[PDB]
Amino acid sequence: ADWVTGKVTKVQNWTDALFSLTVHAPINPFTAGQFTKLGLEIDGERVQRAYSYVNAPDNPNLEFYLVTVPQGKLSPRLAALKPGDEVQVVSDASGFFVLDEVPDCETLWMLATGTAIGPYLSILQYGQDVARFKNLVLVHAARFAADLSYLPLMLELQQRYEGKLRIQTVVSRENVPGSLTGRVPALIENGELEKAVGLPMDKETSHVMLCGNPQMVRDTQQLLKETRQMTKHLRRRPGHMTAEHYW
């Protein structure tokens, strides 16, 4: 896994914990939805972690949306980077959370918690290989309204897609006009998410991508399996769900 040297060109601090890095690095071409590994030297040793590309692959402004994990090894050090700093970038991207691995369906649902919205933003900004889906639905769940860092881009995407892309934000406990409140699995189970979006999530019409918090991913997959007869998708055994856990 050889690497190249990236240079930080922008640091955007969204909240005390959330930031986006913009980096220029001579990486190889990647597929929208894939991740690389970013690395710094910590206590005399190379430390690296996976981070998804937020940018479309044809945009050389590499962008990563991160949360500072308390007591985390690498994230606080990435949080300390300034424009002009170097960071190590693995030159070939990894991952199967990509349209190439998503079967045709009427409605493609894309569920993310927190910083796990990245891969959907890469995919949606790139805008290729989506003609075969009638509907696209992006659901961003975060703890507070203040944590929904890509709403302006989301307004841009919604307009671009002319009604084909439907977007819904979810917050944990706040009452926020325009957002749903609560857990993604609970909002699926009680019908509120589907009512808000105005499209069903079911085996006949949907594929569901799930990205980020393992509890959200696990609980949602268990719910859809037990209550909607929806299965994990495999090349050899076609199904309805594609997942990428962030931990």
Add this chain to the structure above:
Amino acid sequence: ADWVTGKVTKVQNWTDALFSLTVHAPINPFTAGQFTKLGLEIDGERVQRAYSYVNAPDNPNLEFYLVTVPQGKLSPRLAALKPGDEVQVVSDASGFFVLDEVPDCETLWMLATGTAIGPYLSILQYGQDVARFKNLVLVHAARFAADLSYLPLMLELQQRYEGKLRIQTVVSRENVPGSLTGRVPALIENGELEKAVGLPMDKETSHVMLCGNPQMVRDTQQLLKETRQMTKHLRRRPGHMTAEHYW
């Protein structure tokens, strides 16, 4: 002003300085765009200030979007209210920043700084008397992206308006994907706002509503007069610009 007792039902703290109150109170009917006055007793005397309704006239959740003016007489005390607390509400709404005072035109531009987005949210949520406008453009200018409190609602509105409504964010003090950087008058003058929105601002096609900071309001009015032969609108001298300053 004849008043009623409101009960705070919800308080949403957006930022250290921004908050929205929700109130139940037996007010008289109001026109979307109008304001009332909210009041508290401070050192033995009744103090009150004007606040625009954010809610549509048929929504009993009376909602006000406020900035805490540091050491302001009333706003810090309103920021201290908690659900269940009482607040004084004037029962007859005031103001002429309403669609019945807006002349027919092709594109209605709604410009607001900071908390002055309220009257537009009332108008757009009620969604009446807008058939007559081919285009609606809502420009929310704030200092930082963290200050754009109603983006989830704006995204909801943009979706339901099926392309009629265009939402544009402007942030003066940083660069955020999907936002325009700068101040409203400069961005009108240099074509950026019109470029970002995708529609012209001119005397043939436009009416412009302006709400909030008096410097934004007067600088913009002066620019459009000198530069685009657009004038302040009156019943007796029909023109292109409607204004409401917040101080």
